[PDB]
């Protein structure tokens, strides 16, 4: 599914980690197609590195909404 | 199908037109489920306003990449 994160302020480890899985389109503008396994890996790697950033992730689902989104910091 | 705009630097009027569709998660992020009409819409809206900003689209696709994106404004 469509994975996009927005990241602010991230530490440079976390940018790292982010464009294992996914293309950096702009600076700290992240998006690809990826598993909900390797999504839950990238929510927990923002949980745990973000520090005092700032980090949006929205992907797409298949509910009547169409995604799900979570904010960090 | 989804659509994420992240915007920076834009005018007020973009920021507006922008929230008719989609929801403002954060200060320049945007999402929402909407027709490629309505997309259209919004890609012509950000291509005219975005001025002196910087915007990013990524929408889903049927394709095996699975997702399309184009960037616009002063630092592409």
């Known amino acids: 599914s469509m994975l996009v994160v927005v ?3 991230v530490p440079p480890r976390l ?3 982010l ?3 996914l293309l950096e389109v702009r600076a700290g503008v992240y998006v690809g ?5 390797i999504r839950e890996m990238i929510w927990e790697q923002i949980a ?3 520090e005092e950033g700032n980090v949006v992730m929205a992907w797409a ?5 169409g995604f ?5 910091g």
């Not at 689902?61 to 909404?65: A, G, P, V, Y």
């Not at 799900?68 to 960090?72: D, L, Y």
Request: avoid cysteine.
């Open 7 to 9: 990241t602010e302020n």
């Open 15 to 17: 940018r790292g980690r």
């Open 19 to 21: 464009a294992i899985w």
């Open 33 to 37: 197609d990826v598993s909900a396994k």
């Open 48 to 50: 745990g590195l973000a």
């Open 61 to 65: 689902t298949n509910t009547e909404t």
């Open 68 to 72: 799900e989104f979570q904010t960090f």
